[PDB]
């Protein structure tokens, strides 16, 4: 009777990830969902290798919008190219709400939880991934008898400490009384690192192209006028600056917003702009000539 529940972590590959993000953004604010194709290995590795949508439904997250019916169609299509694997759970998109599981999401998850004990549920916020961050969390329900027995400590075996939440109060109400969340790591290859990085062709055309100088004259013009104003703000501060506690001087004789540092900043950021202009210029004189 019973199978143990312990810390896992869901490795979402780059390939997989980009499809959830792309699909979710387009279809939002309507919830899009679909199943996740992958592998289960060892008991700390949920490996999600590929994903694909299940048709967009107005009912949102539901066993009605998945069905074994549509999934069998999708499977036979993947089967013939020999890319079929084993289904590791399901994903869904909240329309702008943080990652937690609803009562209906949990009930979808319970249908799957009978079928594989390690099956995971993944909330994507593709409308929170307009940041630098990517907001996606995965959860897994803990059995009815165990929560009552307080086997919450059981769930913290086989990690060394990496816990950090991105939400509380909706996240933290479901977490104590239903589910235990899993952390997500991201997997890449070294080929992918180059593709991700290059969003330009200007890495062998950046020594033979640059900006026109009319804009450089706009920027250099603006820079000098500014440094005169900041030099006055900076002279005003150093009327004194021998009275103890830096902070008090900055309020009284305005040194707020650190004009000393501010003038330095404008000097650095324009000084680098010109070194580029030169490096493109000199490459042209000597290569061509």
């Amino acid at each position: 009777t019973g199978r143990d529940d312990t810390k896992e972590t869901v490795y979402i590959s780059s390939i997989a990830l980009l499809k959830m993000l792309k699909h979710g953004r387009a279809g939002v604010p309507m919830e899009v969902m679909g199943l996740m194709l992958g592998e289960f290995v060892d008991d700390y590795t949920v490996n999600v290798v590929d994903v694909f949508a299940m048709p967009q439904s107005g009912t949102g997250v539901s066993v009605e919008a998945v069905d074994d019916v549509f999934q069998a169609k999708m499977m036979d299509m993947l089967k013939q190219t020999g890319r079929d694997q084993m289904v590791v759970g399901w994903y869904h998109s909240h329309p702008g709400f943080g990652c937690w599981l609803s009562s209906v999401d949990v009930n979808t998850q319970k249908s799957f939880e009978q079928l594989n004990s390690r099956a995971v549920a993944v909330v994507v916020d593709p409308i929170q991934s307009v940041k630098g961050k990517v907001v996606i969390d995965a959860f897994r329900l803990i059995d009815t008898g165990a929560l009552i027995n307080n086997l919450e400590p059981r769930q913290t075996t086989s990690n060394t400490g990496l816990l950090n939440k991105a939400n509380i109060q909706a996240l933290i109400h479901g977490l104590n009384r239903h589910y235990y969340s899993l952390n997500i790591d991201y997997h890449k290859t070294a080929k992918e690192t180059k593709m991700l990085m290059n969003l330009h062709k200007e890495q062998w055309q950046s020594g033979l192209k640059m900006y026109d100088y009319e804009e450089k004259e706009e920027s250099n013009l603006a820079a000098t006028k500014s440094m005169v104003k900041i030099a006055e703000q900076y002279s005003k501060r150093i009327e004194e600056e021998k009275e103890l506690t830096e902070e008090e001087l900055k309020t009284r004789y305005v040194g707020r917003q650190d004009p000393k540092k501010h003038l330095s900043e404008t000097a650095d950021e324009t000084l680098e702009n010109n070194i580029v202009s030169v490096l493109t210029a000199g490459v042209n004189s000597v290569a061509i000539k």
Binding site: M77, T189, Q203, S206, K289
Partner: protein, 290 residues
């Protein structure tokens, strides 16, 4: 069928999707994986969002014999709309390492699907190149002015990227390198300069042996390359012009601003010289008292 073609922008997802698809069919070791390629077309820039594998067999003694499951594709397209109902057929990817002469016959079969002339997107699976490790071609049928009949032949389209907000941030999210092939600090752009100079050196050298090979390897007189080669010579720089003198007078200008900006820094650093000395002056008294 539209001829509407200028460029190819490529989602990062495509490159990666096709890299795995090649190794999971397990048509590799000089055996090709050929799949369908999905995206928007009927616009100048062909916008490639996604790709899928197709069951494919490659006779390696004869690349002019292959297996393609025509039925399957129709099945697959219905599933592509679920994902995104702007995905329609736009071509098929090839897994490199480059263009072949067995590709025209494969291209034929892909005309029963696409409303645009079938794209051939070479996804290099080894990552060779000095830009994006993709070439793009499209098959266009055109008369030849040399005296021979109408051929179907592959003209290159440039390779480029553009990306969705979700995809672009995901890229950075996965990635963790600070990148010497894009701009950044001064040192980072110094790496880009040296490379660009060497990039001109590598490519100009390639034209020298290509002109020689037409008359010493008996490649044919291809008028389309050489007309562009002539327009390089017309737009090429000169010397001793008042245009080239104005450049020198602009060198004076910008360096002077840099000169003054440098001198401006030095003022600031000499004040921090002086502040620390005020910090030194206090520390003298404390040393005496103890």
């Amino acid at each position: 069928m539209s001829l509407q073609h200028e460029k190819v922008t490529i989602a990062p997802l495509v490159l990666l999707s096709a890299l795995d698809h090649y190794e999971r069919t397990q048509t590799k070791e000089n055996k090709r994986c050929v799949g369908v390629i999905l995206g928007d077309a009927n616009s100048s820039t062909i916008r490639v969002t996604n790709s899928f594998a197709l069951p494919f067999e490659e006779d390696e003694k004869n690349s002019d014999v292959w297996f393609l499951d025509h039925n399957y594709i129709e099945n697959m397209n219905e599933m592509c709309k679920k994902i995104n109902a702007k995905e329609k057929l736009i071509g098929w990817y090839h897994s490199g390492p480059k263009l072949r002469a067995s590709d025209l016959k494969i291209n034929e079969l892909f005309k029963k699907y696409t409303q645009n002339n079938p794209l051939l997107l070479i996804v290099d699976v080894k990552q060779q190149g000095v830009g994006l490790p993709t070439d793009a071609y499209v098959a266009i049928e055109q008369v030849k002015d040399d005296g021979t009949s109408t051929e179907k032949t592959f003209l290159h389209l440039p390779c480029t990227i553009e990306a969705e907000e979700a995809e672009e941030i995901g890229v950075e999210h996965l990635l963790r390198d600070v990148r010497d092939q894009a701009a950044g600090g001064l040192s980072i752009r110094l790496t880009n300069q040296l490379k660009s100079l060497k990039g001109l050196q590598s490519k100009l050298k390639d034209v020298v042996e290509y002109l020689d090979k037409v008359i010493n390897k008996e490649l044919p007189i291809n008028h389309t390359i050489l007309g562009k080669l002539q327009d390089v010579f017309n737009l090429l720089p000169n010397l001793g012009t008042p245009d080239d003198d104005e450049i020198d007078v602009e060198n004076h200008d910008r360096i002077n601003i840099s000169n003054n900006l440098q001198k401006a820094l030095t003022v600031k650093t000499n004040d921090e010289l002086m502040v620390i000395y005020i910090s030194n002056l206090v520390r003298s008294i404390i040393a005496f008292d103890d």
